[PDB]
Copies of this chain bind each other. A is one copy, B any other.
Amino acid sequence: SLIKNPILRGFNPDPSICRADTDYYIATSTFEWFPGVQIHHSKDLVNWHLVAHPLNRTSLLDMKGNPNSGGIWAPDLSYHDGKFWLIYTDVKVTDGMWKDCHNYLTTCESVDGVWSDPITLNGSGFDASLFHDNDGKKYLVNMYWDQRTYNHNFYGIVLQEYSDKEKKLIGKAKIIYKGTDIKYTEGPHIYHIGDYYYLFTAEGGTTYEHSETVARSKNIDGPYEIDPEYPLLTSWHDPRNSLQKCGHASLVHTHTDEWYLAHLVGRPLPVGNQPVLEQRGYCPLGRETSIQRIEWVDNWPRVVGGKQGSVNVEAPKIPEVKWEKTYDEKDNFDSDKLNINFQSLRIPLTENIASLKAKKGNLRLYGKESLTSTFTQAFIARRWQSFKFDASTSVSFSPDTFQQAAGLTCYYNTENWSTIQVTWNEDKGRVIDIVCCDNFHFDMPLKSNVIPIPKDVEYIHLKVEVRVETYQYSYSFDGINWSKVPAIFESRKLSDDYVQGGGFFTGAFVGINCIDITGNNKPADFDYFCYKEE
């Protein structure tokens, strides 16, 4: 039938699409969220399911203390010589005149297997991508960073041979391409198709000015000619399109000899009765992945349906394979494996932080550092993947100080979040309370009007109802009757477009956490986690 974009919803940027015989994979960036690199699978490009996170051990990925929207930027997944190859970037500095980062290569016979110890590559820029040429040679391309303050930082595309035999980059690196006048030249992928090397790049920056352009050359070294009809993909000029920020693309040639282009987009909340060119939108689901049909004209790729990118796209000629949901709407924590849709911040969880074993049918979180910490948070979360949903939990917790809190949280980064918590007060004992951070402005809007929790309540039920432009928390002591808490939040405030700083690259999550400042590691028992889209 039809592909319906986005195919990968909520936080799923920088799609790297990869064909392995008749299997299709997209790797997306995960930034500070662990484990690293989401890999989704499809047989038909219409239906997708989340199946792996290769970077799942400290030896592959060490992001303790990483800044928000540092860590895993755009990943590159390829398949060649009977194995998968993953190029990844760990970004350590996300703002200023430098973007210190490190690029690595790991491999694996399957995407869900145990990936090899990483090979050190370079760090001259992010967006490293591995090209396997048909003569058996291999090359890394990446953007080359120019820190000089009076220059634009995006110096062009650097190319260097990689040797699998020597496990290193070899020979000299060369700038092969400088990009167009749109600039922000990044995301390089090379494809050798017929008589040309095609160099695909993202341009314009990952905002509403995002695009993809194609250039081509008879030789890998260039010089590359820019498509006369550049860009290939962009909706910058069309503020009304459902898909915005169209860029950072990768190309696949299906086994059915068809051509598809994966790319990221943003889908703004309704902007309302406001100037359409000035207010391009807020995107709480972050950067999602969409896919377009490609046709060839005069040996240049072209986006079918127009460069703005379409929502409803002609599917390839492949019999459909639908997938079961990869989570239960109500997760009862009856398995010793945490659901693949849950991630934690920066580091691998250990039994000292989170346990499914300590108490059957519960997730026990042992309190760690606050919601503001870039080190160790006892906190697991999953993506908002719709503008309307309910998420909920119930938690058993016995705090005896305000330094202890456990609850349900909507979270973007360390200075942009809100939460409803079970905590403690000197005069009222156990209470429900609300805390939030709006671009590093902190508030507790209930003040003294916290809600006392009766001593005989074992599990406090906590719910968030996300309703497009706003959301609100509720609680229940019996799991049947719910009371609203009078604090209404704006969803746009958990968006790429609202958050401050050089790194604005993830999206809204909802999850559950336990804070214990005292160092006593107080446990909170969560009986379940629900997430139901409407």
Contact = CB atoms under 8 A, between A and B. Distances in A.
Interface in A179-210: 181-184, 204-205, 209
A372 interface: yes
B152 A274 contact: yes
Contact of A184 (B98, B150, B236, B275): B275
A440 B149 CA distance: 12
Nearest to A372: B96
A159 interface: no
A124 B442 CA distance: 20
A148 B402 contact: yes
B444 A92 contact: no
A276 interface: yes
Interface residues of A, number: 62
A100 interface: yes
A361 to B, nearest CB: 30
A403 B145 contact: yes
B100 A373 contact: yes
A183 B124 contact: no
A517 interface: yes
Contacts of A375: 65, 92-93, 100
B148 A204 contact: no
Interface stretch (A51-59, A115-123, A251-259, A310-318): A115-123
Contact of A442 (B102, B123, B149, B183): B149
B519 A122 contact: yes
Contact of A403 (B93, B120, B124, B415): B124
Contacts of A277: 182, 204, 209, 236
Nearest to A121: B519
Interface in A133-161: 145-152
A517 B124 contact: yes
Contacts of A97: 370, 372, 437, 442
A443 B150 CA distance: 8
A149 B443 contact: yes
Q: Nearest 7 pairs between A and B by C-beta?
A: A65-B65, A122-B519, A183-B275, A98-B370, A123-B519, A209-B277, A100-B369
